[PDB]
């Protein structure tokens, strides 16, 4: 009752199973899944979706039940000399699956190269970090996600 | 394959597609232009940079691009005369279309 | 070698024209676009925009309004003209060769500078 | 517009160590090529600044290789590996990608004695 009365968390939508009939319910666990993603791509959180991120570092089944809530906490990331605290790689390996969990940070990158260093030419290092130092951005501000299951 | 395989190419960039798939995909037509540049001054062949040749001489669009080619050619081009029969386009008073 | 060097008035009124000549010496002409650059005192430096040999240009936006720019190939010379410029903009001109042209930006080489002063 | 930024602002450094100056972008440079295009000044008391790394990898005629830079997206290094009496100066960052290209504030090197 007082997640969903709770105006504080900016957004709270979700199926598999109506809110308000969850006063009601006896399933057997619970999944606390919580991490950082910016204000932007939000949505691609849900499953079925498609993305940099989604597709990439957190993919959800489309048998999936739970619910995803997201709100900002802009009041304790920003306004400073820079964050620099929370990584995330790009567009690069070769998709992923729902519910992995992979962390093989390696170089890695086609045209028939070695493995030395960075060498920007042929290879590059996957992971880079996020940035929301402006105080600009309705989609770049520091927003916080967890998603639960059933 | 055999120009994908050989080692003779110093730089081989695709756009679009991935250099191994192009044998399932089939195109329609595809084309062949040619002609023959610096060592440093390779890379103002690419989807919209500026240049002397991106903007007066030969320009590709933003548009779809295939696969661009280079590789070293100093063997058949060299002495003491210098192949002044080369020649390129220094003065030109406006932009250009793709494919001018 | 090239040896880049500016000239003209280091006092100008508020909202009067501002005209100055990066004379080039050595290397003549040549397929390299020339650029212009200030610093306010006591900060950073700022790019102001880039002339090729025949004439085409691009600016700065900020810019955009109340500036131009030229060449004259007979005298290896060219001019900046700005126009209706206030107190902000008395600073220091340096003149390159290379030009940052949104391709590479290789700055190869510098002028010596120039002060200018806005002041009636 | 993007903005630079380094870290420190001010440095000292003991000659014969190797020291090192960041300089972060907010936005991600890398064009449709596979290079990735900077630049570092160095500006010493009372003259005009001078070239010194291009291309974030390569370095300009006459430039003693001591300078290397590294790095790609928006996260680029310069070392230096051993400082000496005339490396003092102001260092800029600039970026290339896109106009404008603008400088950042500028990184003072001091050299203890």
């Known amino acids: 009752s007082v997640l969903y009365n709770s105006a504080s968390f900016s957004t709270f939508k979700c199926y598999g199973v109506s809110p308000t009939k969850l006063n009601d319910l006896c399933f057997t666990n619970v999944y606390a899944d919580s991490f950082v993603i910016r204000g932007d791509e939000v949505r691609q959180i849900a499953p079925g979706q498609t993305g940099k991120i989604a597709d990439y570092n957190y993919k959800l089944p489309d048998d999936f039940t739970g619910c995803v809530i997201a709100w900002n906490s802009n009041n304790l990331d920003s306004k400073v000399g820079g964050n620099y605290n929370y990584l995330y790689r790009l567009f690069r390996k070769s998709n992923l699956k729902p519910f992995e969990r992979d962390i093989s940070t390696e170089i890695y990158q086609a045209g028939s190269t070695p493995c030395n260093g960075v060498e920007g030419f042929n290879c590059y290092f996957p992971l880079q970090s996020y940035g929301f130092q402006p105080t600009n951005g309705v989609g770049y501000q520091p927003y916080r996600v967890v998603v639960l299951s059933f | 394959s055999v120009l994908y395989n050989s080692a003779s190419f110093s730089t081989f960039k695709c756009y679009g597609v991935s250099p191994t798939k192009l044998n399932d995909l089939c195109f329609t037509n595809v084309y062949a232009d040619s002609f023959v540049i610096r060592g440093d001054e390779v890379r103002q062949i690419a989807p919209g940079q500026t240049g002397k040749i991106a903007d007066y001489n030969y320009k590709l669009p933003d548009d779809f691009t295939g696969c661009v080619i280079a590789w070293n050619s100093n063997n058949l081009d060299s002495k003491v005369g210098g192949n002044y029969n080369y020649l390129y386009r220094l003065f030109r008073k406006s932009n250009l279309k793709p494919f001018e | 070698q090239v040896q880049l060097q500016e000239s003209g008035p280091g006092l100008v009124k508020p909202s009067e024209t501002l005209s100055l000549t990066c004379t080039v010496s050595?290397?003549?002409?040549?397929?390299?676009?020339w650029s212009w650059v200030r610093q306010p005192p006591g900060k950073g430096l700022e790019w102001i925009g880039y002339?090729?040999?025949?004439?085409?240009?691009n600016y700065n936006p900020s810019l955009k309004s109340r500036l131009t720019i030229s060449v004259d190939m007979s005298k290896s010379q060219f001019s900046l003209t700005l126009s209706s410029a206030t107190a902000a903009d008395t600073a220091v001109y340096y003149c390159?060769?290379?030009?940052?042209?949104?391709?590479?930006?290789?700055?190869?080489?510098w002028g010596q500078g120039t002060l200018v002063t806005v002041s009636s | 517009d993007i903005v630079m930024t380094q870290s420190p602002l001010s440095l000292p450094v003991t000659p014969g160590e190797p020291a090192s100056i960041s300089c972060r972008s907010s936005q991600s440079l890398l064009q449709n090529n596979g290079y990735n295009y900077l630049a570092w000044y160095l500006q010493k008391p009372g003259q005009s600044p001078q070239l010194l790394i291009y291309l974030s990898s390569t370095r300009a005629s006459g430039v003693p290789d001591r300078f290397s830079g590294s790095g790609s997206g928006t996260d680029f290094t310069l070392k230096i590996s051993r400082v000496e009496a005339e490396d003092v100066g102001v260092y800029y960052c600039?970026?290339?990608?896109?106009?404008?290209?603008?400088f950042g504030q500028g990184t003072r090197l001091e050299i203890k004695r």
């Open positions: 600039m970026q290339s990608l896109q106009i404008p290209g603008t």
């Open positions: 002339i090729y040999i025949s004439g085409s240009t």
């Open positions: 050595g290397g003549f002409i040549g397929p390299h676009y």
């Open positions: 390159a060769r290379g030009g940052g042209y949104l391709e590479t930006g290789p700055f190869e080489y």
